[PDB]
Design a protein around this ligand. Sequence first.
Ligand code: HEM
Ligand code: HEM
Ligand code: A1H6T
Ligand code: A1H6T
Lengths: 372, 386
Amino acid sequence: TISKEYHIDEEVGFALPNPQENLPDFYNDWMFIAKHLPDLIESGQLRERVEKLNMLSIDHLTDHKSQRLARLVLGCITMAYVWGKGHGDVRKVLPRNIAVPYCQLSKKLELPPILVYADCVLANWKKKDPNKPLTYENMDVLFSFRDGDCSKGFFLVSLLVEIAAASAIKVIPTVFKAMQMQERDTLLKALLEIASCLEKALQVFHQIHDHVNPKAFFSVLRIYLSGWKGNPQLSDGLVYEGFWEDPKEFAGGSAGQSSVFQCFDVLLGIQQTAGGGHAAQFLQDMRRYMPPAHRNFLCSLESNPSVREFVLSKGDAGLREAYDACVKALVSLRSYHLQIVTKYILIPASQQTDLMNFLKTVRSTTEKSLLK
Amino acid sequence: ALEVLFQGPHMWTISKEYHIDEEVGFALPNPQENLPDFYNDWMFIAKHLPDLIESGQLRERVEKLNMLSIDHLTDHKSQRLARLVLGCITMAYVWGKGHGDVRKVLPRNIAVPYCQLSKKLELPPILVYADCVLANWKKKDPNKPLTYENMDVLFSFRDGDCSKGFFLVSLLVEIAAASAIKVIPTVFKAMQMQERDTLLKALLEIASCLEKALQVFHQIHDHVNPKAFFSVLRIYLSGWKGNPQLSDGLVYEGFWEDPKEFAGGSAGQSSVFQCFDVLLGIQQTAGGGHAAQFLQDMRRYMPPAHRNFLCSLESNPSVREFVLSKGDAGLREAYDACVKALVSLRSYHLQIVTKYILIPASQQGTDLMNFLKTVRSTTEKSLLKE
Ligand code: HEM
Ligand code: HEM
Ligand SMILES: O[C@@H](c1cn(-c2ccccc2)nn1)c1c(Cl)ccc2cncn12
Ligand SMILES: O[C@@H](c1cn(-c2ccccc2)nn1)c1c(Cl)ccc2cncn12
């Protein structure tokens, strides 16, 4: 089985298992702002509460779980401070009392000082009842931006798909051992089990329609998910007062930072990061926005022999069909996700396309990997 | 690679799967000089680029070629030679005499086998450092050592372009730096086993190798002249990514519908310099700045096994964090000797770029100087003591 140094959980995969909900009492001033973002933003009191904070030291965040929660807390606060009510009045400077500990904690965890997928999805969750299973009914997010932003449905359904896809990660060492030991039947069973997991993850995706509405997602949630890299509203980036002199550019939170989808593209030899195109550049860049242990895991998968080249060289129809079932399952996930992006982004944008092209390129690359 | 999945990133040995040679490091050991007779038409053009370009006959010879199948290139060495052959031909076809008459479409009979062979080797269809430096060499006498006098390049662009001196001296520096790569597993084993004296000896041995590599660099002046380098060689080293002359990239006829953008050959694609920056925790690829983005992007222009080696070094524990935490002057000084050796190499290289690029450019820009100054500055700021 996969090394503990990669920080992949047997149950939740790349998600942070049982994330911390409360920080030490020393950080109550950060927690108050983070827990009341909807109210402070709406009332125009948020920027003042952030500006009134004292610079708190990161030294009292003793373990990884408390450091991850503080990163989620500070990152949510930073998005609300920069974007405000989300109507054009942006802030181009982040106050030193929040920027200094945010950048120091970010340097410690090897993550950029901006809200990432590992913060808002992987560490932004809790079980309502610890004795009940990981189902939507028994779960909640830790932080939201606005009342009615559908951040619970959006972040939780992504997390549930991450968790569903994680049951196929345990099969990865079985695949590489079967190839090395030349165990054809073992490899075929392993590939069919990965396909089975990815097919099941598509059913999990269907839940998006019951917990997210297009108007609230597009007009409200979208604003706080935005970053400051190539953003016309913050063309030079954000100033991290007291940490860097010049404004720094960082891309906003993205599911392109999910390690579970990138690890199946690497496993199946779908060269998403090859060819010098825009989609390849984006997905490669998003690896530096992943937790270092997860970024290391992706490297290690790439360093292993190609499953695609192995299957292509055997002249075995059963093995080729098991490989194609894995690729077809990823194509179906991405095709369904394209229909979702049309419903939640494309159509609401018309009632008020570069993202669609990115998703269509990634999907096309997956489709072109079928051996047929 | 299978044990790294179960036990974790622990590079206590340099696996043969990384394709690092004990003698030449990241360079391709004893590269192939001749292709099978089936490819004689490719070899004739590649071997006579200076003459065909000068006479205006090159584009016609390329356009008259038949589409040759890549199936007859059976091993890695023949595939690497063919990539160097086709890449040199592509630079000459696109740039011509180097005076503004560019070609925006690469003929299918050369673009199809170039892109197929590139896809096979996981390298972009443009001449890279692993082609023009690492695989562009031969020993004149196999029984004599790896010295400039006993070596030659396989391909050149123009008569008097100094490509032999430029490519061979880079190769000799790569080879000199390679003797420090064998010490990398000694460093990670010493840290794991907490063998302080072993670690100190290992760090001083790496510094010794990098210091010796600076002396190898001095040979550049005897084999390259600034006028020929700047006015002639520079042209053929250019790519088509952010290039005003080919703003949309090159069309690889019969392979892709749209023009694709690929950056030109760069020593930023050298794995030996990037591996010591990673080893010493000089975070060249961090911060989101232009230098960081460039060096990260250049990893996809490296051979896949070498790109894998770099990310495996990043996955391993930090030598810098280990040395910083020990309160040991001798260990800090051995680490600083390694960093100071890289600062000296980059400072000397800045003087070289002034001589060969800056001054000739002025006798008729500084964006490359700023890139080199940022990389040098990052190295200098990694010293634990000034
Ligand atoms: C309200 C529903 C959703 C919308 C509107 C949506 C939107 C988007 C957009 C705009 C992108 C492009 C990258 C970017 O801009 O950051 C993207 C990428 C992606 N999304 Fe979603 N998404 C939704 C639900 C989900 C769910 C539930 C998952 C499951 C984990 C998910 C997984 C991905 C992945 C893996 C990518 C990266 C590209 C790929 O590998 O295909 N998305 N999404
Ligand atoms: C005629 C002499 C030389 C000139 C004019 C020259 C020029 C350049 C230029 C313009 C760059 C910036 C990146 C790019 O534009 O692609 C560069 C980078 C670099 N060069 Fe050279 N170079 C010379 C000799 C050498 C030699 C002999 C080596 C040895 C292998 C070398 C190693 C490097 C490295 C490692 C980089 C990447 C940046 C760094 O890590 O500092 N150069 N060079
Ligand atoms: O990529 C982001 C993201 C950004 N946007 C967006 C919306 C409208 C206009 C521009 C960007 N939509 N999603 C993302 C996050 Cl942060 C979390 C989970 C997830 C699932 N699929 C995508 N996910
Ligand atoms: O980085 C390239 C390179 C690019 N340029 C250049 C100069 C002027 C205008 C445009 C490009 N010069 N050298 C390079 C190659 Cl391809 C091979 C060895 C080497 C050593 N140092 C740099 N090396």
